[PDB]
Amino acid sequence: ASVYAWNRKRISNCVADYSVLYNSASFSTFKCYGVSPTKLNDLCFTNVYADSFVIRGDEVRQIAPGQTGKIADYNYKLPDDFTGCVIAWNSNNLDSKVGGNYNYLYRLFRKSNLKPFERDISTEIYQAGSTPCNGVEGFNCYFPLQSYGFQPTNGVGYQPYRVVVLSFELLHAPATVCGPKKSTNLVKNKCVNFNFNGLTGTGVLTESNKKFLPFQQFGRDIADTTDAVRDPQTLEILDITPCSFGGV
């Protein structure tokens, strides 16, 4: 979608793998503000908004907190306190058709600097003076929605850069977007340390004959000591016994 109407999709209830994002080399710009790029896979957020558009390459730097410019002031403005990241990747071959693509257009003029995460579609003629426009384009009245101009042979700064700004919102509601939990292979008959889905413990993990109910995840004994657990993968019950200790 053109930058004058940036396409915003919300995402929730999904396990997001941001590792593939920065591990991929297609993206030219991966400036992430607020959150460390490596730690993105280890944070849980209530929801994530993906606002996508196409921009001129030379204006790609404008998409960030604290910068002014036509795209920043009149098309899409990020907050001063932004906790997210900005994917920006050149798409010269896809978006620059032969003869110049004119479908993508941007808002050059607007009476007031729009608030962060505001979208203005209204194709209303700008006053630009004291003249009553009355909906006709005059010397002072004109349409503030101009197409970029996308000839296939252009300067590299004028090429299409497709930009998606991932904005993470963490409300009071439970977080639904998280990174991959990851896993390790299981070792049975060794005094080890284990973290079964947040269950932190030590000991030897035998294969057990316990018949858990399907919903149950782990089992305690009398005096409430954890002595059994299903590994989340393969859904099989294990039996925990403490590492050998005694007096000498």
């Epitope: 003029f109 009553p132 009355n134 909906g135 006709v136 005059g138 009245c141 004109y142």
Partner: antibody, heavy 112, light 111 residues
Framework: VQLQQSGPELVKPGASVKISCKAS????????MNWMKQSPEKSLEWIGE????????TDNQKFKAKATLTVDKSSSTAYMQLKSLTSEDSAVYYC???????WGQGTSVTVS | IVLTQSPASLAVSLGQRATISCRAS??????????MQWYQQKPGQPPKVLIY???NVESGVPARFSGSGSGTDFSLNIHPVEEDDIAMYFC?????????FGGGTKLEIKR
Amino acid sequence: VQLQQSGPELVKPGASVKISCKASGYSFTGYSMNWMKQSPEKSLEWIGEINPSTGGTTDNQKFKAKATLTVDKSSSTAYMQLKSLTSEDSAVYYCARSRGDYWGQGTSVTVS
Amino acid sequence: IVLTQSPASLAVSLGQRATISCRASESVEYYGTSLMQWYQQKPGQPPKVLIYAASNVESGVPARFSGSGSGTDFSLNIHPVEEDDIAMYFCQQSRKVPWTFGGGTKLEIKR
């Protein structure tokens, strides 16, 4: 989307002529229909502005004397009628879209 | 507002960087927007428009055309000059009710 301007004139001094412009492929509703005067040597200048949506007439004060601007919704045309004619007011008259991205071919009104 | 165009005529070699200047009688910028428009007119041709305002350019005008300025001072920039860019270039203003054009800036291939 073109623009056409009709009529070469030779009318005697003191009269009035309504130069007509056919809008052709315009939308003729959201685009001001501007009137311009190119003096034969070089001098261009703005006659007046008409809002085809309503019919508002914003005209230059010095030429507000007897120049009037009319919009015709039926033919979507512009009629510029400059009452009273004199030798010096013999210049090319043009009609343009908005600021002038599309002009007419032009008429040579020659008070003779 | 009455504008003054300098120079009256200016010579270019094909592909030489070109600049033409206009001076305004009063301030043109109000509310952060300047409102002058400059035109090119080949002989026997309807004069077109190159700029919506102070600096920006209309669609259909080649990107080689540019311009900028503030207040009274304004100037174009025709960096690649070809045989087509041989004409007179006017400069408008839009502030006072009488909208006034300028004089004449003839572009000539230098020799």
